[PDB]
């Protein structure tokens, strides 16, 4: 049946992150709600199991985004720039903190289209659920607001966003 | 001159974290006191990266080809190692939060020698500076978390890490 099993909590922003990626990659999965988590089991890789959402996401793109539709290649400088943003997102998902995170984002996005290169990647996507909590916005962080809005309009993400309610 | 420039704050745990890896890999570097930390690789057209665990990933993937202290990119173990690096960055951004983190560590290290089955990696190294502060909470560390305390202690005894710890001491 389904290639992956995703263990998550019901409204879990992290589970949502991972789901956005699964959908972007056209991968089949089953979601199981509990109540670390989230966790991913890959039935085509000996039921290899990984947790930490951004690690899960790295695994999905490196192994299953060979077309680089939403990710850069392993072993390139760009990969470590992608990784740096994925760490920034994870550190920032855990006020002035929100504004500081947004400030960094704006400082980059006002100058280039996406967090790495001029391609939407999982670096950008990783902020969506958190950012759809962090909300006047378009006034103080216009580049970020616009980028966020445009990410939401990608068909896979719009579908996930529907399921999200 | 020095292959890397590391920007960091004077007593910074994240800096020490990165320095551990630079030394384990025998790479030349200069430290400048002031995200931060940030690393500049003069042998890679001054490619520049920040976030200590992204920096560290960069350092092992490119410069630990012998796999002395890391696993190969592409393998499942790589993603497990990555898992622990994210857990290190997150879990340690009352202080039962500390005991929660140590709890997770203990549940693993009581059943296996290191975080990634078999050998010490940067996954293990990543916790060292944070763990040093946490063990300044009396002896609840070695009492509640003996596997973790053993593991931590033995990591500190690695020559390179001992050297970095002398530097960290005098700094």
Short mmCIF file of N, CA and C in Angstrom, two decimals, chain B:
data_model
loop_
_atom_site.label_atom_id
_atom_site.label_comp_id
_atom_site.label_asym_id
_atom_site.label_seq_id
_atom_site.Cartn_x
_atom_site.Cartn_y
_atom_site.Cartn_z
N UNK B 1 47.23 31.32 4.38
CA UNK B 1 46.94 31.34 5.80
C UNK B 1 45.90 30.32 6.28
N UNK B 2 44.91 30.77 7.04
CA UNK B 2 43.98 29.81 7.63
C UNK B 2 42.87 29.43 6.66
N UNK B 3 42.53 28.14 6.56
CA UNK B 3 41.50 27.75 5.59
C UNK B 3 40.16 28.39 5.93
N UNK B 4 39.82 28.39 7.21
CA UNK B 4 38.51 28.90 7.61
C UNK B 4 38.63 30.16 8.47
N UNK B 5 37.65 31.04 8.35
CA UNK B 5 37.45 32.05 9.37
C UNK B 5 36.13 31.67 10.03
N UNK B 6 36.16 31.56 11.35
CA UNK B 6 34.98 31.30 12.17
C UNK B 6 34.63 32.59 12.92
N UNK B 7 33.45 33.13 12.67
CA UNK B 7 32.98 34.24 13.48
C UNK B 7 32.15 33.67 14.60
N UNK B 8 32.40 34.16 15.81
CA UNK B 8 31.70 33.65 16.99
C UNK B 8 31.74 34.69 18.09
N UNK B 9 30.92 34.52 19.12
CA UNK B 9 31.04 35.34 20.32
C UNK B 9 32.08 34.70 21.24
N UNK B 10 32.69 35.52 22.11
CA UNK B 10 33.81 35.08 22.96
C UNK B 10 33.60 33.70 23.65
N UNK B 11 32.69 33.62 24.62
CA UNK B 11 32.50 32.33 25.26
C UNK B 11 31.46 31.39 24.64
N UNK B 12 31.17 31.55 23.35
CA UNK B 12 29.99 30.94 22.76
C UNK B 12 29.95 29.43 22.59
N UNK B 13 28.93 28.76 23.17
CA UNK B 13 28.82 27.30 23.04
C UNK B 13 28.73 26.87 21.61
N UNK B 14 27.97 27.60 20.79
CA UNK B 14 27.91 27.25 19.38
C UNK B 14 29.25 27.35 18.66
N UNK B 15 30.04 28.34 19.04
CA UNK B 15 31.38 28.46 18.53
C UNK B 15 32.22 27.26 18.93
N UNK B 16 32.12 26.87 20.21
CA UNK B 16 32.95 25.78 20.70
C UNK B 16 32.59 24.52 19.96
N UNK B 17 31.28 24.32 19.82
CA UNK B 17 30.71 23.23 19.05
C UNK B 17 31.39 23.14 17.70
N UNK B 18 31.42 24.25 16.95
CA UNK B 18 32.05 24.21 15.62
C UNK B 18 33.56 23.95 15.71
N UNK B 19 34.18 24.49 16.75
CA UNK B 19 35.62 24.40 16.92
C UNK B 19 36.05 22.96 17.18
N UNK B 20 35.19 22.25 17.89
CA UNK B 20 35.42 20.85 18.17
C UNK B 20 35.61 20.13 16.84
N UNK B 21 34.72 20.41 15.89
CA UNK B 21 34.74 19.69 14.63
C UNK B 21 35.94 20.11 13.80
N UNK B 22 36.23 21.41 13.78
CA UNK B 22 37.41 21.88 13.05
C UNK B 22 38.65 21.15 13.53
N UNK B 23 38.75 20.98 14.84
CA UNK B 23 39.94 20.33 15.39
C UNK B 23 39.97 18.83 15.14
N UNK B 24 38.82 18.17 15.30
CA UNK B 24 38.73 16.74 15.07
C UNK B 24 39.19 16.42 13.64
N UNK B 25 38.82 17.28 12.69
CA UNK B 25 39.20 17.12 11.28
C UNK B 25 40.59 17.72 10.93
N UNK B 26 41.29 18.30 11.91
CA UNK B 26 42.60 18.87 11.65
C UNK B 26 42.61 19.98 10.60
N UNK B 27 41.59 20.83 10.63
CA UNK B 27 41.50 21.94 9.68
C UNK B 27 42.04 23.21 10.31
N UNK B 28 42.65 24.07 9.49
CA UNK B 28 43.21 25.32 9.96
C UNK B 28 42.12 26.38 9.95
N UNK B 29 42.10 27.22 10.97
CA UNK B 29 41.06 28.23 11.12
C UNK B 29 41.51 29.38 12.02
N UNK B 30 40.83 30.51 11.88
CA UNK B 30 41.03 31.64 12.75
C UNK B 30 39.70 31.95 13.38
N UNK B 31 39.69 32.33 14.64
CA UNK B 31 38.43 32.70 15.29
C UNK B 31 38.39 34.20 15.45
N UNK B 32 37.26 34.80 15.07
CA UNK B 32 37.03 36.23 15.29
C UNK B 32 35.83 36.43 16.21
N UNK B 33 36.03 37.19 17.29
CA UNK B 33 34.98 37.48 18.27
C UNK B 33 34.19 38.76 17.94
N UNK B 34 32.88 38.75 18.20
CA UNK B 34 31.99 39.86 17.87
C UNK B 34 31.13 40.35 19.04
N UNK B 35 22.95 34.93 11.05
CA UNK B 35 23.33 34.72 12.45
C UNK B 35 24.86 34.59 12.69
N UNK B 36 25.20 34.46 13.97
CA UNK B 36 26.52 34.05 14.42
C UNK B 36 26.29 32.80 15.28
N UNK B 37 27.18 31.79 15.17
CA UNK B 37 28.43 31.70 14.41
C UNK B 37 28.28 31.60 12.89
N UNK B 38 29.37 31.88 12.18
CA UNK B 38 29.41 31.82 10.72
C UNK B 38 30.79 31.34 10.32
N UNK B 39 30.82 30.60 9.24
CA UNK B 39 32.04 29.98 8.76
C UNK B 39 32.30 30.42 7.30
N UNK B 40 33.55 30.79 7.03
CA UNK B 40 33.99 31.14 5.67
C UNK B 40 35.13 30.20 5.26
N UNK B 41 34.92 29.50 4.15
CA UNK B 41 35.84 28.48 3.66
C UNK B 41 36.63 29.08 2.50
N UNK B 42 37.85 29.51 2.78
CA UNK B 42 38.64 30.19 1.77
C UNK B 42 39.08 29.29 0.61
N UNK B 43 38.97 27.98 0.79
CA UNK B 43 39.27 27.05 -0.28
C UNK B 43 38.05 26.73 -1.13
N UNK B 44 36.90 27.29 -0.77
CA UNK B 44 35.69 27.10 -1.58
C UNK B 44 35.13 28.46 -2.00
N UNK B 45 36.02 29.31 -2.51
CA UNK B 45 35.63 30.62 -3.00
C UNK B 45 34.92 31.43 -1.91
N UNK B 46 35.33 31.21 -0.66
CA UNK B 46 34.77 31.90 0.50
C UNK B 46 33.28 31.63 0.64
N UNK B 47 32.83 30.46 0.21
CA UNK B 47 31.49 30.03 0.59
C UNK B 47 31.30 30.24 2.09
N UNK B 48 30.13 30.75 2.45
CA UNK B 48 29.86 31.20 3.80
C UNK B 48 28.56 30.57 4.25
N UNK B 49 28.60 30.00 5.45
CA UNK B 49 27.42 29.34 5.98
C UNK B 49 27.26 29.67 7.47
N UNK B 50 26.02 29.81 7.92
CA UNK B 50 25.75 29.96 9.36
C UNK B 50 24.78 28.89 9.86
N UNK B 51 24.44 28.94 11.16
CA UNK B 51 23.85 27.81 11.91
C UNK B 51 24.91 26.73 12.17
N UNK B 52 25.24 26.56 13.44
CA UNK B 52 26.38 25.72 13.82
C UNK B 52 26.22 24.28 13.34
N UNK B 53 24.99 23.78 13.32
CA UNK B 53 24.85 22.40 12.88
C UNK B 53 24.85 22.25 11.36
N UNK B 54 24.49 23.33 10.67
CA UNK B 54 24.64 23.30 9.21
C UNK B 54 26.14 23.43 8.89
N UNK B 55 26.82 24.29 9.63
CA UNK B 55 28.26 24.50 9.44
C UNK B 55 28.99 23.18 9.61
N UNK B 56 28.72 22.55 10.75
CA UNK B 56 29.29 21.25 11.08
C UNK B 56 28.94 20.19 10.02
N UNK B 57 27.70 20.18 9.56
CA UNK B 57 27.38 19.22 8.48
C UNK B 57 28.31 19.46 7.26
N UNK B 58 28.46 20.73 6.90
CA UNK B 58 29.32 21.13 5.79
C UNK B 58 30.73 20.59 5.98
N UNK B 59 31.26 20.82 7.17
CA UNK B 59 32.63 20.42 7.48
C UNK B 59 32.83 18.90 7.35
N UNK B 60 31.90 18.09 7.87
CA UNK B 60 32.14 16.65 7.78
C UNK B 60 31.89 16.10 6.40
N UNK B 61 30.88 16.62 5.72
CA UNK B 61 30.52 16.04 4.42
C UNK B 61 31.63 16.29 3.42
N UNK B 62 32.24 17.48 3.51
CA UNK B 62 33.31 17.82 2.59
C UNK B 62 34.70 17.39 3.05
N UNK B 63 34.93 17.38 4.35
CA UNK B 63 36.30 17.19 4.83
C UNK B 63 36.49 15.97 5.75
N UNK B 64 35.46 15.13 5.88
CA UNK B 64 35.64 13.88 6.62
C UNK B 64 35.40 12.71 5.68
N UNK B 65 36.10 12.73 4.54
CA UNK B 65 35.92 11.71 3.52
C UNK B 65 36.38 10.36 4.03
N UNK B 66 37.35 10.36 4.94
CA UNK B 66 37.75 9.12 5.61
C UNK B 66 36.72 8.63 6.63
N UNK B 67 35.70 9.45 6.89
CA UNK B 67 34.63 9.11 7.83
C UNK B 67 35.18 8.82 9.24
N UNK B 68 36.12 9.64 9.67
CA UNK B 68 36.68 9.49 11.01
C UNK B 68 35.62 9.80 12.08
N UNK B 69 34.80 10.81 11.84
CA UNK B 69 33.85 11.24 12.87
C UNK B 69 32.46 11.52 12.34
N UNK B 70 32.08 10.85 11.26
CA UNK B 70 30.77 11.08 10.64
C UNK B 70 30.42 9.90 9.74
N UNK B 71 29.17 9.81 9.31
CA UNK B 71 28.79 8.74 8.39
C UNK B 71 28.62 9.28 6.97
N UNK B 72 28.57 8.39 5.98
CA UNK B 72 28.49 8.83 4.60
C UNK B 72 27.15 9.45 4.25
N UNK B 73 27.20 10.62 3.60
CA UNK B 73 26.06 11.26 2.95
C UNK B 73 25.37 10.24 2.08
N UNK B 74 24.04 10.21 2.10
CA UNK B 74 23.31 9.25 1.28
C UNK B 74 22.81 7.99 2.00
N UNK B 75 23.48 7.60 3.08
CA UNK B 75 23.12 6.39 3.81
C UNK B 75 22.03 6.71 4.83
N UNK B 76 21.29 5.70 5.28
CA UNK B 76 20.25 5.91 6.30
C UNK B 76 20.85 6.51 7.57
N UNK B 77 22.03 6.02 7.91
CA UNK B 77 22.73 6.50 9.09
C UNK B 77 22.93 8.00 9.01
N UNK B 78 23.10 8.53 7.80
CA UNK B 78 23.28 9.97 7.62
C UNK B 78 22.05 10.70 8.11
N UNK B 79 20.89 10.15 7.77
CA UNK B 79 19.66 10.81 8.19
C UNK B 79 19.40 10.68 9.69
N UNK B 80 19.87 9.58 10.29
CA UNK B 80 19.80 9.43 11.76
C UNK B 80 20.71 10.43 12.47
N UNK B 81 21.94 10.52 11.98
CA UNK B 81 22.88 11.52 12.44
C UNK B 81 22.22 12.91 12.32
N UNK B 82 21.51 13.14 11.22
CA UNK B 82 20.92 14.45 11.03
C UNK B 82 19.82 14.67 12.07
N UNK B 83 19.12 13.58 12.36
CA UNK B 83 18.03 13.58 13.32
C UNK B 83 18.54 14.06 14.66
N UNK B 84 19.65 13.49 15.09
CA UNK B 84 20.25 13.88 16.35
C UNK B 84 20.78 15.31 16.32
N UNK B 85 21.28 15.76 15.18
CA UNK B 85 21.72 17.17 15.09
C UNK B 85 20.56 18.15 15.23
N UNK B 86 19.42 17.82 14.62
CA UNK B 86 18.23 18.66 14.82
C UNK B 86 17.73 18.59 16.24
N UNK B 87 17.77 17.39 16.82
CA UNK B 87 17.30 17.27 18.20
C UNK B 87 18.24 18.11 19.10
N UNK B 88 19.55 18.03 18.88
CA UNK B 88 20.50 18.87 19.64
C UNK B 88 20.20 20.36 19.46
N UNK B 89 19.95 20.80 18.23
CA UNK B 89 19.72 22.24 18.04
C UNK B 89 18.41 22.69 18.70
N UNK B 90 17.41 21.81 18.72
CA UNK B 90 16.06 22.20 19.14
C UNK B 90 15.85 22.05 20.62
N UNK B 91 16.12 20.84 21.09
CA UNK B 91 15.83 20.44 22.45
C UNK B 91 16.62 21.32 23.39
N UNK B 92 17.76 21.81 22.91
CA UNK B 92 18.55 22.74 23.70
C UNK B 92 18.80 24.10 23.02
N UNK B 93 17.72 24.85 22.82
CA UNK B 93 17.82 26.22 22.35
C UNK B 93 18.50 27.07 23.40
N UNK B 94 10.25 24.76 34.22
CA UNK B 94 11.60 25.05 34.69
C UNK B 94 12.64 24.31 33.85
N UNK B 95 13.84 24.13 34.40
CA UNK B 95 14.86 23.35 33.72
C UNK B 95 14.74 21.86 34.07
N UNK B 96 13.52 21.37 33.88
CA UNK B 96 13.26 19.97 33.70
C UNK B 96 13.29 19.73 32.20
N UNK B 97 13.41 20.82 31.44
CA UNK B 97 13.60 20.73 30.00
C UNK B 97 14.93 20.04 29.73
N UNK B 98 15.93 20.45 30.49
CA UNK B 98 17.23 19.81 30.49
C UNK B 98 17.13 18.30 30.78
N UNK B 99 16.39 17.96 31.82
CA UNK B 99 16.23 16.56 32.19
C UNK B 99 15.41 15.83 31.13
N UNK B 100 14.56 16.55 30.43
CA UNK B 100 13.78 15.96 29.35
C UNK B 100 14.74 15.57 28.21
N UNK B 101 15.60 16.51 27.82
CA UNK B 101 16.64 16.26 26.82
C UNK B 101 17.54 15.08 27.21
N UNK B 102 18.12 15.17 28.41
CA UNK B 102 18.94 14.10 28.96
C UNK B 102 18.18 12.79 29.01
N UNK B 103 16.87 12.86 29.24
CA UNK B 103 16.02 11.68 29.28
C UNK B 103 16.06 10.98 27.94
N UNK B 104 15.84 11.76 26.88
CA UNK B 104 15.90 11.22 25.53
C UNK B 104 17.26 10.60 25.24
N UNK B 105 18.32 11.31 25.62
CA UNK B 105 19.69 10.83 25.41
C UNK B 105 19.90 9.48 26.13
N UNK B 106 19.58 9.46 27.42
CA UNK B 106 19.71 8.29 28.26
C UNK B 106 18.98 7.07 27.70
N UNK B 107 17.76 7.27 27.19
CA UNK B 107 16.98 6.12 26.71
C UNK B 107 17.68 5.42 25.54
N UNK B 108 18.53 6.17 24.84
CA UNK B 108 19.30 5.63 23.72
C UNK B 108 20.65 5.08 24.17
N UNK B 109 21.41 5.93 24.84
CA UNK B 109 22.77 5.61 25.23
C UNK B 109 22.85 4.48 26.25
N UNK B 110 21.73 4.13 26.88
CA UNK B 110 21.72 2.98 27.80
C UNK B 110 21.67 1.67 27.02
N UNK B 111 21.37 1.76 25.72
CA UNK B 111 21.12 0.57 24.89
C UNK B 111 22.13 0.44 23.77
N UNK B 112 22.88 1.52 23.53
CA UNK B 112 23.91 1.55 22.50
C UNK B 112 25.01 2.56 22.85
N UNK B 113 26.23 2.26 22.41
CA UNK B 113 27.40 3.06 22.75
C UNK B 113 27.31 4.56 22.36
N UNK B 114 26.83 4.86 21.15
CA UNK B 114 26.77 6.25 20.66
C UNK B 114 25.41 6.55 20.04
N UNK B 115 25.18 7.81 19.65
CA UNK B 115 23.87 8.17 19.09
C UNK B 115 23.61 7.50 17.75
N UNK B 116 24.64 7.42 16.91
CA UNK B 116 24.55 6.69 15.64
C UNK B 116 25.33 5.37 15.70
N UNK B 117 24.59 4.27 15.84
CA UNK B 117 25.12 2.91 16.13
C UNK B 117 26.59 2.58 15.79
N UNK B 118 27.45 2.63 16.80
CA UNK B 118 28.80 2.13 16.60
C UNK B 118 29.93 3.08 16.91
N UNK B 119 29.92 4.25 16.27
CA UNK B 119 31.05 5.15 16.38
C UNK B 119 30.62 6.54 16.82
N UNK B 120 31.51 7.20 17.56
CA UNK B 120 31.33 8.60 17.86
C UNK B 120 31.28 9.42 16.56
N UNK B 121 30.26 10.26 16.45
CA UNK B 121 30.13 11.21 15.34
C UNK B 121 29.90 12.63 15.83
N UNK B 122 29.83 13.55 14.88
CA UNK B 122 29.50 14.93 15.22
C UNK B 122 28.13 14.99 15.88
N UNK B 123 27.32 13.96 15.70
CA UNK B 123 26.04 13.94 16.40
C UNK B 123 26.33 13.96 17.92
N UNK B 124 27.22 13.08 18.37
CA UNK B 124 27.62 13.08 19.76
C UNK B 124 28.34 14.37 20.15
N UNK B 125 29.19 14.86 19.26
CA UNK B 125 30.02 15.99 19.64
C UNK B 125 29.13 17.20 19.86
N UNK B 126 27.99 17.24 19.16
CA UNK B 126 27.16 18.45 19.11
C UNK B 126 26.61 18.81 20.49
N UNK B 127 26.48 17.82 21.35
CA UNK B 127 25.91 18.02 22.68
C UNK B 127 26.92 18.48 23.76
N UNK B 128 28.21 18.29 23.51
CA UNK B 128 29.25 18.53 24.51
C UNK B 128 29.22 19.91 25.21
N UNK B 129 29.22 21.01 24.44
CA UNK B 129 29.25 22.29 25.16
C UNK B 129 27.97 22.51 25.95
N UNK B 130 26.82 22.21 25.34
CA UNK B 130 25.55 22.35 26.04
C UNK B 130 25.49 21.50 27.32
N UNK B 131 26.05 20.29 27.24
CA UNK B 131 26.03 19.32 28.33
C UNK B 131 26.91 19.76 29.49
N UNK B 132 27.97 20.49 29.16
CA UNK B 132 28.85 21.02 30.19
C UNK B 132 28.14 22.02 31.10
N UNK B 133 27.31 22.88 30.51
CA UNK B 133 26.52 23.82 31.29
C UNK B 133 25.41 23.14 32.07
N UNK B 134 24.74 22.19 31.42
CA UNK B 134 23.67 21.44 32.06
C UNK B 134 24.15 20.68 33.31
N UNK B 135 25.41 20.25 33.31
CA UNK B 135 25.98 19.53 34.44
C UNK B 135 26.48 20.53 35.50
N UNK B 136 26.09 21.78 35.32
CA UNK B 136 26.16 22.78 36.38
C UNK B 136 24.73 23.14 36.79
N UNK B 137 23.87 22.12 36.73
CA UNK B 137 22.42 22.17 37.02
C UNK B 137 21.76 23.55 37.02
N UNK B 138 23.66 18.63 42.56
CA UNK B 138 24.98 18.28 43.04
C UNK B 138 25.64 17.21 42.20
N UNK B 139 25.09 15.99 42.26
CA UNK B 139 25.57 14.87 41.45
C UNK B 139 24.43 14.16 40.73
N UNK B 140 23.33 14.88 40.50
CA UNK B 140 22.13 14.30 39.89
C UNK B 140 22.41 13.80 38.49
N UNK B 141 23.41 14.38 37.83
CA UNK B 141 23.79 13.95 36.49
C UNK B 141 24.16 12.46 36.49
N UNK B 142 25.26 12.11 37.16
CA UNK B 142 25.75 10.73 37.13
C UNK B 142 24.82 9.74 37.82
N UNK B 143 23.84 10.26 38.56
CA UNK B 143 22.90 9.44 39.32
C UNK B 143 21.63 9.10 38.55
N UNK B 144 21.10 10.08 37.81
CA UNK B 144 19.86 9.92 37.07
C UNK B 144 20.13 9.53 35.64
N UNK B 145 21.32 9.86 35.17
CA UNK B 145 21.64 9.65 33.78
C UNK B 145 23.02 9.04 33.64
N UNK B 146 23.22 7.83 34.20
CA UNK B 146 24.60 7.33 34.19
C UNK B 146 25.16 7.01 32.80
N UNK B 147 24.35 6.47 31.89
CA UNK B 147 24.89 6.17 30.54
C UNK B 147 25.35 7.47 29.90
N UNK B 148 24.50 8.48 30.00
CA UNK B 148 24.79 9.78 29.40
C UNK B 148 26.02 10.40 30.05
N UNK B 149 26.13 10.30 31.37
CA UNK B 149 27.28 10.89 32.04
C UNK B 149 28.57 10.17 31.66
N UNK B 150 28.51 8.85 31.56
CA UNK B 150 29.67 8.08 31.09
C UNK B 150 30.10 8.53 29.68
N UNK B 151 29.16 8.48 28.75
CA UNK B 151 29.34 8.88 27.36
C UNK B 151 29.96 10.29 27.21
N UNK B 152 29.39 11.23 27.95
CA UNK B 152 29.84 12.61 27.93
C UNK B 152 31.29 12.67 28.42
N UNK B 153 31.53 12.01 29.55
CA UNK B 153 32.86 12.01 30.14
C UNK B 153 33.90 11.46 29.16
N UNK B 154 33.57 10.36 28.49
CA UNK B 154 34.53 9.75 27.56
C UNK B 154 34.76 10.58 26.30
N UNK B 155 33.71 11.23 25.81
CA UNK B 155 33.89 12.20 24.72
C UNK B 155 34.89 13.28 25.12
N UNK B 156 34.75 13.82 26.33
CA UNK B 156 35.68 14.85 26.80
C UNK B 156 37.14 14.37 26.80
N UNK B 157 37.34 13.06 26.88
CA UNK B 157 38.68 12.50 26.97
C UNK B 157 39.36 12.32 25.62
N UNK B 158 38.61 12.49 24.54
CA UNK B 158 39.19 12.47 23.20
C UNK B 158 40.19 13.63 23.05
N UNK B 159 41.43 13.31 22.63
CA UNK B 159 42.57 14.24 22.51
C UNK B 159 42.16 15.61 21.95
N UNK B 160 41.58 15.65 20.76
CA UNK B 160 41.15 16.90 20.13
C UNK B 160 40.20 17.73 21.00
N UNK B 161 39.21 17.05 21.56
CA UNK B 161 38.21 17.68 22.42
C UNK B 161 38.82 18.12 23.76
N UNK B 162 39.78 17.36 24.26
CA UNK B 162 40.54 17.77 25.43
C UNK B 162 41.31 19.08 25.15
N UNK B 163 41.93 19.16 23.98
CA UNK B 163 42.63 20.37 23.58
C UNK B 163 41.68 21.57 23.50
N UNK B 164 40.54 21.36 22.84
CA UNK B 164 39.56 22.44 22.72
C UNK B 164 39.06 22.86 24.10
N UNK B 165 39.02 21.90 25.03
CA UNK B 165 38.55 22.17 26.38
C UNK B 165 39.54 22.97 27.20
N UNK B 166 40.83 22.79 26.94
CA UNK B 166 41.85 23.64 27.53
C UNK B 166 41.72 25.07 27.01
N UNK B 167 41.61 25.20 25.68
CA UNK B 167 41.37 26.51 25.07
C UNK B 167 40.14 27.19 25.68
N UNK B 168 39.03 26.46 25.75
CA UNK B 168 37.76 26.94 26.34
C UNK B 168 37.91 27.34 27.81
N UNK B 169 38.69 26.56 28.55
CA UNK B 169 39.02 26.88 29.93
C UNK B 169 39.68 28.25 30.04
N UNK B 170 40.84 28.41 29.41
CA UNK B 170 41.60 29.67 29.51
C UNK B 170 40.88 30.89 28.92
N UNK B 171 40.04 30.65 27.91
CA UNK B 171 39.19 31.70 27.35
C UNK B 171 38.10 32.10 28.35
#
